[PDB]
Design a protein around this ligand. Structure first.
Ligand SMILES: [Mg+2]
Ligand SMILES: [Mg+2]
Ligand SMILES: [Mg+2]
Ligand SMILES: [Mg+2]
Ligand SMILES: [Mg+2]
Ligand SMILES: [Mg+2]
Ligand SMILES: [Mg+2]
Ligand SMILES: [Mg+2]
Ligand SMILES: [Mg+2]
Ligand SMILES: [Mg+2]
Ligand SMILES: [Mg+2]
Ligand SMILES: [Mg+2]
Ligand SMILES: [Mg+2]
Ligand SMILES: [Mg+2]
Ligand SMILES: [Mg+2]
Ligand SMILES: [Mg+2]
Ligand SMILES: [Mg+2]
Ligand SMILES: [Mg+2]
Ligand SMILES: [Mg+2]
Ligand SMILES: [Mg+2]
Ligand SMILES: [Mg+2]
Ligand SMILES: [Mg+2]
Ligand SMILES: [Mg+2]
Ligand SMILES: [Mg+2]
Ligand SMILES: [Mg+2]
Ligand SMILES: [Mg+2]
Ligand SMILES: [Mg+2]
Ligand SMILES: [Mg+2]
Ligand SMILES: [Mg+2]
Ligand SMILES: [Mg+2]
Ligand SMILES: [Mg+2]
Ligand SMILES: [Mg+2]
Ligand SMILES: [Mg+2]
Ligand SMILES: [Mg+2]
Ligand SMILES: [Mg+2]
Ligand SMILES: [Mg+2]
Ligand SMILES: [Mg+2]
Ligand SMILES: [Mg+2]
Ligand SMILES: [Mg+2]
Ligand SMILES: [Mg+2]
Ligand SMILES: [Mg+2]
Ligand SMILES: [Mg+2]
Ligand SMILES: [Mg+2]
Ligand SMILES: [Mg+2]
Ligand SMILES: [Zn+2]
Lengths: 120, 51, 86, 102, 49
RNA sequence: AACUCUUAGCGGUGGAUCACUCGGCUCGUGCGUCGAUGAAGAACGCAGCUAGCUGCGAGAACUAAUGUGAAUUGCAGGACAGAUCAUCGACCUUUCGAACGCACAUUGCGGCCCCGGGUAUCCCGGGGCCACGCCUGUCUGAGGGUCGCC
RNA sequence: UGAAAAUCCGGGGGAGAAGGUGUAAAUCUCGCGCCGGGCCGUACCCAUAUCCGCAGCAGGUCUCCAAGGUGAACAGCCUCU
RNA sequence: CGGGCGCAGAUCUUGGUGGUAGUAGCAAAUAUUCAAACGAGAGCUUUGAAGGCCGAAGUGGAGAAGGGUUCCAUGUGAACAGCAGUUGAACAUGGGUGAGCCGGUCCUAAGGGACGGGCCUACGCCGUUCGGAGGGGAGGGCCCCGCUCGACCGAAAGGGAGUCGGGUCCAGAUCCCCGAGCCCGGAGCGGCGGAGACGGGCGGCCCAGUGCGGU
RNA sequence: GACCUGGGCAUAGGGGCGAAAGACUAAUCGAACCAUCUAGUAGCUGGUUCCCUCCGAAGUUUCCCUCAGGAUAGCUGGCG
RNA sequence: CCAUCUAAGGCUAAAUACCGGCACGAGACCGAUAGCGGACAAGUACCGUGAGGGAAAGUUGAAAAGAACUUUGAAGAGAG
RNA sequence: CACGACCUCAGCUCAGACGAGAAGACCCGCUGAAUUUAAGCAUAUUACUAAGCGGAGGAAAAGAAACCAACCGGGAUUCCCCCAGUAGCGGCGAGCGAAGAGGGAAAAGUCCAGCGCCGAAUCCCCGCCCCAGGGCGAGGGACCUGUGGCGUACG
C-alpha cells in the first residue's frame, strides 16, 4: 500500500490489487453493520486510502503516457493543455509578441537608445 | 434494477429472480433482491457475513 | 373573512426551490425565480440592497476553483513541473 | 456598431461608416475583426485589437462613432471632459481634497 | 403529501438526518463548548417552507 | 402574634461593574489572479464512533509529490510508524448552475457513434457525443443574379 | 349547443408482392410457444391534537362510502356496525 | 495632551425585576362509575363490567392539497403537552414506504414560451402557428417521392393499453407470498400448428386456385 | 340558477380587477408590499447629563405671504 | 489684416484611482448593550408566499484535580 | 441545353477557434429621479447624483494638437498645488462655477488610409524537413473590389 511500490507494477497488476482492495472494503462494510470489531472498523479508512492510492497511481500513469503520446502534436486534448487562466490562455504567444514589423525592425536597428553619461 | 441485478451476480455469483428497489426516507435506495429458486438466501447470507 | 378564516385556504405553493440559487423563490406560474432571476442568463443583483448582495456574492460559498487560483497565483501558475524528488 | 458588436461577441468593432439614408432608416456598415485569426494575431501592426483592454470598445465610447458623443478633445470647447471622461472631470472637481496639513 | 418529487424527498431526507442530537463524546472533545444541537427542529413548531 | 415599614447581617433573584480579548473598526503597504479546459453561487453526498461548523467530492474529514521528523487524541482502534503538520508544481474533482440534446414542482423524454453481455435485430450496461451566436477554411448546394461556351 | 390532442381502427384505393401444381408470398388465428418491461412517488395524519390561523385555537380547508325505527324525507329523535 | 467624558425624565433604547397576584382564570358541543392490574406514586394509564354519547350530511372508514417521520416497537418520565400522567403527535434508541398492468411518465386544455422577423441605447421586449431556402425522412438505386411544419412546456380531478383473489407485518400491500390472468414491445429463422391448400381437363401433358357461408 | 366549488391558468401598483362598496388586490388599499434615495424636511411637540462663584434679562421698536417664526433696535454678558 | 492649428482613421508606457479581492504591517480607536449584523455551529437560528428581515449568545480552575465512597429519597435534590 | 467562371445567398454533430456568465471598490458608455434648498413654489438647486442598463483592466480612461495664447510666446495626455470660490452662470434669488499661464510628479512617442514606385515582392491553411528559433512542398486557399515594403504633416 505504498505509492512507490505501485509505480513499478503493470496495468493488470494494479487493477488486480485494486479489485482485491475493493472486495476487502466490501467485507468491512458488512462488518460495520453486523457489529464487527474495533480492530476491523478502523481498517475501513486504511483500505479506502489504499484504494485512493492505487487509483491515483493508475490515473497519473495514464496521463503520463497521454502527455507523452500527444507530445509534438499540433492539437492536444483540452485536459492536456495548460490551464493557466482563461485570460492568460487568450494572450499572444511569445512568438507573436516577439514579432516586429519591418519598419520598427529598422527603427530599432539604428535608432535604439544609446548608453551614455553626462558630466554635469 | 438491471445494474443491481448484475452487481449481485458479479459480487456473489447468484442468479436473481427479481429486484424491488426502494428509496428510504433517509435517502438511501434499498434493494429487495430475490434469488432464483435454486439458490438459498440463507446460504448466501452466511457467505457474505449477515449471519 | 379577511383574517383567521382566510389563512386556512392556503395549500397551493406559489414558489418552489430554484435550480440555480436553491432558494424557495422560484415562482411556478411565472417560471421565474424571485431571488436570482432564473432562468434568465444574468443574475438579478441590485445595488439598492447591500445586504442582499452580501449574502450571495463571491466568497459566501465554497469557491472550489477560485481558492485554488489564489494558491496557484502566489507561485506564478506553475504547471507541468514537479518538486525535485528525494 | 454597438448593435453589431453585441450580436457578434467573438469579434471586435473596428470602425463603421455611412452607406445609406431614408426617412425611417439609416444604414451603416461596421468593420469587425476576428482577434483570434492568425492573419491578425501575427501581424504586429494590428495586434493591439487582440488585447483584452479593447473588449467591446464600441460599448465604452472607444470607436470613432461612439467617442464623438463623449465630448472629448483638446481646447477651450471641451473643458467638461478634462481628465478623460466627463465623469472623471466631475469627480475631480467635486472631490474635497482634505490635505494632511490644512 | 404522498405524491413527492425526487428533489423534495431528497431535501426532506437531509433535514431528517440533521435532526439528530450531538454525540455525547463531542462534549468531551470541545470541552463542553457545544452543549446541545441548537439546530434541532420539531415538525410542529417550525416548518421547512 | 401576624401584617406593614425602616436598618444591618446572611441567603436568593438578577445581572451590572471591574479585570480579561485568537474580534471589530480605521490607516498604510505590496500584489492586483474568475469563467464553456465549465466560473461564482447552489444542491446532495463524504468521518470507526459525526448533528452543526469547517475541509473535501464516489480517490469524498482527503491521494500523490516535496518539506518536515514522532504523533493524532473525545473514545478507541490502527499506523506498510516516515506518524503528523505545512507546502502544494502531479492526479482527482458528484448534480444543478453562463449550463449546452429537449426539458424540469419530472433525477422526465429523445437522437448518433462505439464497446461489452444476452444474442447482426432487439434488450442491458459502459464510453464518446447532439444548445445558441459567430469567425477562417473545407465540403455539399441554391438562384438566367451577371456572363462565357454553344 | 356544452373541448382539443396523443393513440387506435374500418373502408376506399389496386400501386405491388408471390408459386406454377404443390407449394410460395402473405397472415389482424386470446391457436400455441419464446424474451423483456427501465426511472420516480408509495409509511402516516388528512382534522374539535399531524394542514393554515404564533397553539393540541369553538375558525378555515377539495372528495369517496354510508344501516335499523319513526316520518314525505340525506329533517329532528332513538338504535346497530 | 486627546475625547464617543458625567443623566431621573425624552409615551427614551436594551436587559432585569416588582405591586396587582396565589388574583383574572383553567365554564361551548349530556357522563361517568366499580373493581383489578402495572407502578415509589393513579379521578386521568391499562383490563373487565356497568351506565352514556357521536347515530351512516358520524365524534365511523379511506384519500387530495398541505405536513415530513409526526408512522411502528421499546425505553425515559428532566423539559414541553396551560391539573396530573405509569400517557403522548414529547424525549431517547431502533425499525418501516418493495409495482410492466396505482399514479407520474405519454397527450394538449386554457395558457406559457422559443424559432423567423421586427422592436429596443440596452438588460431585453413584442409576437405564436403564423413568418424563413423552417423537410435530414424516403420508396427505388447513383436516380425521383414527403406538409395541413410549426420547437417545447403545461392536468397525480381531462384524454391515456393492461391486476385481480386469498394470505402475510410491530408498522408495508391491487407492490411482499401463493394462485389465476392481462397489456405492450421484440424477434433476417419471426419456435410449432392451422390458414392460404381443393382440385379440374386430357393421357405424363395442360389448366386453375391472395378462403368461405347466408335472399 | 346571474348556483356552489377544487385544481390548472390570465390580468401587478397610479397598474389590475370591480352586478360599483373606493370595494378587492396575502390580517396592509381614497393607490399593496420590499429595499434604497434616507440619518428625507419639520418656523412643530419631547428630551438635552458635575459642582461652586459673579453678572443678569425680554415679551417692546421697525421690516418680513410675518401673527406658534425670523431680521432689526433695545435690554444682557464677556473682553478690554 | 494678423496669429495659430490641420478636423471628420489608429496605437501608446509611466505619474493617477481603488470601501471588491489576495497577502501583510500598524493604531493617542472599540472593549461583549461597545466594536462590523456577526469576538461564539452569523448572514446562523428564526419570520414572511416572496422581494427581503434578521438576532440573542465571550470568562470554572494553574491543572478536571469535574466531587470516589457512605447515607435519605422513586428521582430530582440533600447530608457527610 | 447541359457544361464552366463569377456574383449573391444557404446547409452541416464539417476542420479549427472565439463569444456568453460572475465580480464590479476603482474605470468606461448610457439612462435618470425625487426627497432637499429657495423658509411657499414652477426655472434653478438637489444632480448631468441615487437607483436602472451595457462594457472592461490591474489600472481604466485620456493622449501626441483643426491646442493654448496675443506674449521676449508656450507645446501630447494624466495627476497634484495654485489659478479660485475667480471669470462667469442664476426667479442675477437661493445658489452654482471652470480654464490659459505659473509651480511640481511622470515624461515617449508614433502607425495607417490616401499620393505612387516595386513582376503580390503579402497572408492564412495543410503536409513536412532542421536546430521557441529557421526552412520546404510543380499542396490547397486569401488577395488586384488591393496584401506587403518605402512613406504621414516634424514634410
Ligand atoms: Mg507600412
Ligand atoms: Mg450584474
Ligand atoms: Mg401548524
Ligand atoms: Mg432616614
Ligand atoms: Mg446579596
Ligand atoms: Mg461543473
Ligand atoms: Mg383494403
Ligand atoms: Mg397509504
Ligand atoms: Mg380546530
Ligand atoms: Mg405563518
Ligand atoms: Mg330511517
Ligand atoms: Mg351522499
Ligand atoms: Mg333520518
Ligand atoms: Mg456621549
Ligand atoms: Mg436611568
Ligand atoms: Mg427513526
Ligand atoms: Mg402539565
Ligand atoms: Mg412507559
Ligand atoms: Mg404513535
Ligand atoms: Mg422525535
Ligand atoms: Mg407534457
Ligand atoms: Mg387522469
Ligand atoms: Mg372529455
Ligand atoms: Mg396501511
Ligand atoms: Mg399449410
Ligand atoms: Mg378554483
Ligand atoms: Mg403606487
Ligand atoms: Mg363615497
Ligand atoms: Mg437628526
Ligand atoms: Mg409652544
Ligand atoms: Mg486609445
Ligand atoms: Mg454586538
Ligand atoms: Mg467583518
Ligand atoms: Mg459579461
Ligand atoms: Mg422648499
Ligand atoms: Mg421649510
Ligand atoms: Mg413642499
Ligand atoms: Mg448608480
Ligand atoms: Mg481581471
Ligand atoms: Mg499604474
Ligand atoms: Mg488604454
Ligand atoms: Mg451644477
Ligand atoms: Mg495650466
Ligand atoms: Mg500630427
Ligand atoms: Zn433562483
Amino acid at each position: 500500500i505504498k505509492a512507490r511500490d505501485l509505480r513499478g507494477k503493470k496495468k493488470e497488476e494494479l487493477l488486480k490489487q485494486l479489485d482485491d482492495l475493493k472486495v476487502e472494503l466490501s467485507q468491512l462494510r458488512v462488518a460495520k453493520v453486523t457489529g464487527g470489531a474495533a480492530s476491523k472498523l478502523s481498517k475501513i479508512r486504511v483500505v479506502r486510502k489504499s484504494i485512493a492510492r492505487v487509483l491515483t497511481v493508475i490515473n497519473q500513469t495514464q496521463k503520463e503516457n497521454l502527455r507523452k503520446f500527444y507530445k509534438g502534436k499540433k492539437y492536444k486534448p483540452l485536459d492536456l493543455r495548460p490551464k493557466k487562466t482563461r485570460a492568460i490562455r487568450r494572450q499572444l504567444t511569445k512568438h507573436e509578441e516577439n514579432l516586429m514589423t519591418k519598419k520598427m525592425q529598422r527603427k530599432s536597428r539604428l535608432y535604439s537608445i544609446r548608453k551614455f553619461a553626462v558630466k554635469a | 434494477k438491471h445494474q443491481i441485478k448484475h452487481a449481485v451476480k458479479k459480487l456473489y455469483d447468484i442468479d436473481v429472480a427479481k429486484v424491488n428497489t426502494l428509496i428510504r426516507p433517509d435517502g438511501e435506495k434499498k434493494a429487495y433482491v430475490r434469488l432464483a429458486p435454486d439458490y438459498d438466501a440463507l446460504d448466501v447470507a452466511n457467505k457474505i457475513g449477515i449471519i | 373573512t379577511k383574517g383567521t378564516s382566510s389563512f386556512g385556504k392556503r395549500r397551493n405553493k406559489t414558489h418552489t426551490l430554484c435550480r440555480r440559487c436553491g432558494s424557495k423563490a422560484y415562482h411556478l406560474q411565472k417560471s421565474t425565480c424571485g431571488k436570482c432571476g432564473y432562468p434568465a442568463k444574468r443574475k438579478r443583483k441590485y445595488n439598492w440592497s447591500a445586504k442582499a448582495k452580501r449574502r450571495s456574492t463571491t466568497g459566501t460559498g465554497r469557491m472550489r476553483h477560485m481558492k485554488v487560483v489564489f494558491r496557484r497565483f502566489r507561485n506564478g501558475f506553475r504547471e507541468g513541473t514537479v518538486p525535485k524528488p528525494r | 456598431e454597438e448593435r453589431a458588436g453585441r450580436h457578434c461577441g467573438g469579434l471586435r468593432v473596428l470602425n463603421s461608416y455611412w452607406v445609406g439614408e431614408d426617412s425611417t432608416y439609416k444604414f451603416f456598415e461596421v468593420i469587425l475583426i476576428d482577434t483570434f485569426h492568425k492573419a491578425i494575431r501575427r501581424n504586429p501592426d494590428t495586434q493591439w485589437i487582440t488585447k483584452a483592454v479593447h473588449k467591446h470598445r464600441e460599448m465604452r465610447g472607444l470607436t470613432s462613432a461612439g467617442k464623438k458623443s463623449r465630448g472629448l478633445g483638446k481646447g477651450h470647447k471641451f473643458h467638461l471632459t478634462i481628465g478623460g471622461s466627463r465623469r472623471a472631470a466631475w469627480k475631480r472637481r467635486n472631490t474635497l481634497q482634505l490635505h494632511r496639513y490644512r | 403529501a404522498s405524491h413527492k418529487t425526487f428533489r423534495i424527498k431528497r431535501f426532506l431526507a437531509k433535514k431528517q438526518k440533521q435532526n439528530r442530537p450531538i454525540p455525547q463524546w463531542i462534549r468531551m472533545k470541545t470541552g463542553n463548548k457545544i452543549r446541545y444541537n441548537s439546530k434541532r427542529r420539531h415538525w410542529r413548531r417550525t416548518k421547512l417552507g
